[PDB]
RNA sequence: GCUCGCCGGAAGACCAAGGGUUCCUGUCCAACGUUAAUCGGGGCAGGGUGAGUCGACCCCUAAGGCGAGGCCGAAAGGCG
């Protein structure tokens, strides 16, 4: 899951979780096809 | 979906006339439907009509209308 820890200043602590494209490009492709089968653009049928 | 029953020179398919979105899809049931309606030709929102060769347009005229001038009529106008 690519866990990484660091320290910024004072008492804080940052983490920089840099996941790969397979959990990023799919994250775009999971959020596209759940819209077109549900939403109705004004020019078309409901779900085509 | 399965049996049942009727029309079958029509209660079947088409075109002109006429109407004017009534056709398709989603959604809604208050009103309209001679009853209840999830359904509709009802309410709302979105789509749908592609032509050198089919029709209109155009070329040509019939009945008949209009009629430059012209004839005739108090005026309007009547014929050609």
Curated annotation (Swiss-Prot):
Record gene name: tig
Protein name in UniProt: Trigger factor
Family: Belongs to the FKBP-type PPIase family. Tig subfamily.
Disruption phenotype: Non-essential; synthetic lethality is seen in a triple tig-dnaK-dnaJ disruption, although this depends on temperature (triple disruptions grow slowly at 20 and 34 degrees Celsius but not at all at 43 degrees) and strain background.
PTM-bearing positions, type ADP-ribosylarginine: 45
PTM characteristics: (Microbial infection) ADP-ribosylated by the phage T4 protein ModB.
Subcellular location: Cytoplasm
Record remark on domains: Consists of 3 domains; the N-terminus (residues 1-112) binds the ribosome, the middle domain (residues 150-246) has PPIase activity, while the discontinuous C-terminus (residues 113-149 and 247-432) binds substrate and has intrinsic chaperone activity on its own.
Full-sequence range covered: 1 to 48 of 432
Its biological purpose: Involved in protein export. Acts as a chaperone by maintaining the newly synthesized secretory and non-secretory proteins in an open conformation. Binds to 3 regions of unfolded substrate PhoA, preferring aromatic and hydrophobic residues, keeping it stretched out and unable to form aggregates. Binds to nascent polypeptide chains via ribosomal protein L23. Functions as a peptidyl-prolyl cis-trans isomerase in vitro, this activity is dispensible in vivo for chaperone activity.
Quaternary organization: Homodimer and monomer. In vivo most of the ribosomes are in complex with monomeric TF; binding as a dimer has also been suggested. Uncomplexed TF is in a monomer-dimer equilibrium with approximately two thirds of TF existing in a dimeric state; binding to substrate PhoA induces monomerization, 3 TF monomers bind somewhat independently to a single substrate molecule. TF and SRP can simultaneously bind to ribosomes; TF binding is abolished when SRP is bound to FtsY in the presence of a non-hydrolyzable GTP analog. Contacts ribosomal proteins L23 and L29.
């Amino acid at each position: 899951m690519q866990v990484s820890v660091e320290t910024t200043q004072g008492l804080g602590r940052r983490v920089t979780i840099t996941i790969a494209a397979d959990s990023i490009e799919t994250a775009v492709k999971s959020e596209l096809v759940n819209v077109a089968k549900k939403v109705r653009i004004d020019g078309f049928r409901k779900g085509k």
